[PDB]
UniProtKB/TrEMBL annotation, chain B:
It comes from the Viruses. Homotrimer; each monomer consists of a S1 and a S2 subunit. The resulting peplomers protrude from the virus surface as spikes. Disulfide bonds join C25-C76, C42-C72. Belongs to the betacoronaviruses spike protein family. Glycans are attached at N14, N41. It comes from Human betacoronavirus 2c (isolate EMC/2012). Fusion peptide 1 (FP1) and fusion peptide 2 (FP2) function cooperatively and have a membrane-ordering effect on lipid headgroups and shallow hydrophobic regions of target bilayers. They are considered as two domains of an extended, bipartite FP. The membrane-ordering activity is calcium-dependent and also dependent on correct folding, which is maintained by an internal disulfide bond in FP2. It is found in: Virion membrane; Host endoplasmic reticulum-Golgi intermediate compartment membrane; Host cell membrane. Specific enzymatic cleavages in vivo yield mature proteins. The precursor is processed into S1 and S2 by host cell furin or another cellular protease to yield the mature S1 and S2 proteins. Additionally, a second cleavage leads to the release of a fusion peptide after viral attachment to host cell receptor. Spike protein S1: attaches the virion to the cell membrane by interacting with host receptor, initiating the infection. Spike protein S2': Acts as a viral fusion peptide which is unmasked following S2 cleavage occurring upon virus endocytosis. The gene is S. This is Spike glycoprotein.
Length: 80, 96, 48
């Protein structure tokens, strides 16, 4: 078993404030296949200056997906 | 499906290399992909990290060698033959 | 693997020193048939 290091020294893990309303926004960034968005390249070979059909694992054209945002925490002056 | 990654470790001595064989019809076994063809020096094309370069019809047409050169790959070609036959004199010639 | 989740991450920065962190989008994958255009350098610049 890979040794990963010491366990946590602190007992009291920090508090998190769940406020979904702040993160619930809209910023549409749909898949635009016309500029090859989210395309996994064929993982065995390569081609040059051609156009071919290919069966693989791609996302839907125009799909909006799920948006996620990360934010800073609460802080008073100089103390998170 | 079309990707193979475990292959027989065979030594390349020194005369068994892509270089010093350009223009000759040779057998090849490159990283588990084997066949017969003629190698040449072509200008680089395709994506380097995916050393094998194919065409629309799943034919290998290029290769990225460990020496840092892009080698341009073909198939060994046949010489067509026909026979010119005269029945009365029972004479024949060969057209290539 | 049958399930996954995103792990939240907060930046414990100073109230007077805070940045904006770009939102990221997750799109699922399906077994579809695409039409891909490979250029001379081998990159896919457009598909259908």
């Amino acid at each position: 078993y890979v040794d990963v290091g010491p366990d946590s020294v602190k007992s009291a893990c920090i508090e998190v404030d769940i406020q979904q309303t702040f993160f619930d926004k809209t910023w549409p960034r749909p898949i635009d296949v016309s500029k090859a968005d989210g395309i996994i390249y064929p993982q065995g070979r390569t081609y040059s200056n051609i156009t071919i059909t290919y069966q693989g694992l791609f996302p839907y054209q125009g799909d909006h997906g799920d948006m996620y945002v990360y934010s800073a925490g609460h802080a008073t002056g100089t103390t998170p | 499906t079309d990707t193979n990654s475990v292959c027989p470790k065979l030594e390349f001595a020194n005369d068994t290399k892509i270089a010093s064989q350009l223009g000759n019809c040779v057998e090849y076994s490159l990283y588990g992909v084997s066949g017969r063809g003629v190698f040449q020096n072509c200008t680089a094309v395709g994506v380097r990290q995916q050393r094998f370069v194919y065409d629309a019809y799943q034919n290998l047409v290029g290769y990225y060698s460990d020496d840092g050169n892009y080698y341009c790959l073909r198939a060994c070609v046949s010489v067509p033959v026909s026979v010119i036959y005269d029945k009365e004199t029972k004479t024949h010639a060969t057209l290539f | 693997i049958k399930y996954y989740s995103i792990i939240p991450h907060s930046i414990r920065s100073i109230q007077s020193d805070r940045k904006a962190w770009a939102a990221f989008y997750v799109y699922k994958l399906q077994p579809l048939t695409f039409l891909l255009d490979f250029s001379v350098d081998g990159y896919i610049r457009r598909a259908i």
